[model samples]
Target: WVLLSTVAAVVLGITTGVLVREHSNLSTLEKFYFAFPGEILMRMLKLIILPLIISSMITGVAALDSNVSGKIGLRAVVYYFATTLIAVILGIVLVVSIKPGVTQKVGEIARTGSTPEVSTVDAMLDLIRNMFPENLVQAAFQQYKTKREEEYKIVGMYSDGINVLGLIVFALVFGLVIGKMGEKGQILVDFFNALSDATMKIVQIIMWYMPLGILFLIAGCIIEVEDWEIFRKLGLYMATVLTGLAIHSIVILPLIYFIVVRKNPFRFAMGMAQALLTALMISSSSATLPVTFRCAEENNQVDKRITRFVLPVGATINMDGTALYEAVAAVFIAQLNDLDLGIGQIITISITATSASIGAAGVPQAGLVTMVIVLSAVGLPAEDVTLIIAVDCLLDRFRTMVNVLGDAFGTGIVEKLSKKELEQM
Candidate 1:
């Protein structure tokens, strides 16, 4: 659906909505009704999101921390970022070739909300400044009342910033500190062990709504988009995403597994059939961890130590497909905004593509936020996200498949590298 839509969008993107509005017989209400499916699905996904993110991340991170946490974390971050880099390179190449978002439509058309434009200089400043936080409490959870206070009070803003990445970095550093502290870390280890249990159970509860959430997501997208609204307006954008994802999943991932690990790519993919299907159905990479672990260890015959060390980490860091998808997405947005890329812009896309991919999670719509970051990195309007909103949900499933497949394939590749010493893992 996303592919077809992306192709059509490229074609239609050039033809202003005025042509359709003038030529078509449909009334304003009909047109409005026709264009709403994707939006509704987006809302439903948003509703369940907080719990999904907190539960999934806490569960995965805590569990990994308890057992082989150190090594697996390293593997996951490495693989995720590496694949993301590949995706960025691909996005820059493809968009240049296809010119997907280059629209002939003119005039400063009205958009729903402002899409802020930031330059690379500004983006770099934002990235560097935001990655680390001076105050520990300011980085993690927000205090609702105090958060409101921070919102209203100009000076108190520093006390209420939700620096998620800072929180993650802090936790990792704190965990390492515990690892080195001997007995001091023992109690801390036990605390995280219990935290993992609590979080997994929390995740299990979140899983019950999985089917409904998916049903609403798909059904809603189908309903609001007037059957093929996605295909009509945003086709090329979707195609770029799907094409990038497909390359990552089918070709890039397999090549990695074969050249790096000497694994039978065909058999491994076949063995993962059930797991892949589940990931497609649920559209959640982190949610698919239990099955991913099972497939890597039991079905594909990857070592437990390696699978254990790499996959959870993969879930966190390695999102080759998402990174690529977002890179393509950013370029698509840039095209829509009538922006052209020079060599530097292309290189920036590659760098941001890789970085976004490494940090991308398997959770639904999380990439939306990250894609905004990607656009922000290159000084594009994040509101270009709204343009992709037309077909994002449809594309998300395939993009997600590429993401998880990359994770599994990436783990194999990571393990395959440094064959001399890391062989046991």
Candidate 2:
């Protein structure tokens, strides 16, 4: 019923959006009212996010016995790095072959002011700083970001975004400590278990509202488009990214699972179809996580121990789709400017894109922020990013689905590889 409703909502949203666009006019205020329910949905999801992350991570890690935790962790990391790299390389190949930006007329759109210079060093430092936040309370609502100041000085300061990386690190350690405490840690463990349990209950209640919220969300986004011509110009670029995402999720991801697990990948995917649809509509893997958990355990019969340990970390770091999008977008920007990138520069872009995607927050359109880092690595004009912003909302959904799919596939692969260890535990 959830899947059918979500599918219907998307179809209705597109039909209504097109009908409204052709037949009526809506003012900015009217558009706001139209999208209000979607806004509330986002807010409610955001409200639960902090508690969900904290409790989920702490309880997940605490539940893991130290012996199998190491094995599972190793396999998960290996799968993450391998898949993410493949995605980046695949994106580069597609963009270079398609040459999406070469045919575009230049100087059509006015370029904005140059974006702040973000060096790879600063990005790495900020990532590390966010991993060890000074105050746990502040980490819930704020994270360290490097701001470029006068004379091109980069300084670290608190910014208003959940420090998810830091929170994950802290929770992992906290859970490990609790695991070691044995009998003494039981109360703390149970406390977090209850918290996560309650959070998921709320997620169940929220699911019922999702179709309605998604309906308005898609319609409002389509209704607000001022220039449909941008799509015509960037059609190839959008196609390139979408094709990469499709191949990654449809072909490459499934092939990996089939080869490693000796099972029908489509069967596994069918089990989690609902989660994938949720990721596409919500366009945020973090928000889709609870559903991912439910689908994996209930439908696919994946071990809860694996889902809890892998999903949170994967949602935060294993952004294969974002990595591919960033790579394509950065190179497409370069091609737009008629800049002849050297082999060395392309290599730099690839590396930076991979790391930037991992650093990217698991929220809507966070790819745009990391796109700057990839652009800066190749000395591409940051202002060129605006050229792609027009269609990113649409692309964001596809990439986010790929991201969630990658995480889901990871859980299955790790579970298969660690079957012996898990059985022993």
Candidate 3:
């Protein structure tokens, strides 16, 4: 992917208005190549979110009725959000200092997206509204109803603009109602659980073709790449982000694990090996859930209750590694381009990182997609996606493992913190 996309971009650049001038105007063949795999794969991902989110939410929030998963979830959410935003802001600061884009022989884009100026407070309100959909049905409607916002198109009804908090609320209410509805809710809960399993089986069937999907995505990218030299020329900028990612994933995360879980991660890694391995290759944590559940139970001794509650929710919302990576990538890209982000854009990166941290899917290629949202929110060129897309699969292997590692660590740390009874079993 890295090699292919670069070749294509450069060739397209040199030809100027050749080979489907822009992403929107791709040739029929190019469109087919890009569309089918991403479409099938994305919908498969979308299908999983509903069962995963609702089940995870209900189970997680129900555990709140016990004051463990809920409290720990709250604390985890806060810490995760704060750390992610900090990482993003730090990346912006450091990358602006590095400037990788200056080395590019490319001309300035005349149509960089227009900035949507709004008050910081207004932005916060938008965030709240998006996170707390009054109706899950409405949210799902918007997700798949249009050409936009298809990433992880959620299930049930909600508003067009959805929110994590809102989704959480709906799941909580639904779960609590099930828990309280005497025998009737139990029947429904069992039905959903069975449905969830059935859906997961469908997911399993879909994944058999994943190798094909990934192959196509990467093949298209490889055929188009022409910038093998770009990495060498901008080594410093790439190295900065790459180095930061390594330190955080290898060092920072482990330190947090030791401090919180009070044990060497050596034992944990042995258990997480399979799931991590899958994440490394597939670049998606959500898709890796069945493996994650199996590994956590057999190797780590994570309770079925906890794993059941946390991993699915973690798939959607727990992206410590992705947050850190996004921060570094955003800054590095900005530096390479010689674009000095405004203090506001810097702040926006932090805010955007926090959202993307949670909003990001735990799968391979999800980082680039989330980055598109991040760049667009900060008024940067979404066209940058073309550049990042090529390298994403290569980095995705490591980055996705980072995501799964974060997921396991996050759930474990929360468990230990809350003194959940399941820790014994």
Cα error, candidate 3, residue 136 (Å): 2.9
Clashes of each: 15, 0, 42
Better candidate by TM-score, 2 or 3: 2
Measured on C-alpha atoms, candidate 2 has an lDDT of 0.84
How close to the true structure is residue 158 of candidate 3, measured as C-alpha lDDT? Answer: 30
Error at 81, model 1, angstroms:
3.1
lDDT by residue (143-170, candidate 1, tens digit) is 1111223435412234332344444555
lDDT of 3 by residue, 1-425 (tens): 32244345334433442333333355557646653664475457556666666666675455334355456557567545544554455455555655555555334322232233223333344445556665577654342111212454423323332244456557767776776665776676776677656765775675565555544444444434444664464466456566656666667667877887889876886778666755664566666766576577767887556566667666666666677667767755665466666777777776676655353354234466567667766666766655555455556656667667766766677667666455532
* Best-matching candidate per lDDT: 2
Positional deviation of residue 344's Cα in model 2 after best superposition, in angstroms = 1.4
RMSD of 1: 8.7
Candidate no. 1 TM-score: 0.65
Question: Which ranges in model 2 have alpha carbons more than 4 Å from their true place?
Answer: 109-119, 150-154, 362-365
Q: Which has the greatest TM-score?
A: 2
Give per-model CA RMSD: 8.7, 1.9, 8.6
TM-score of each: 0.65, 0.95, 0.67
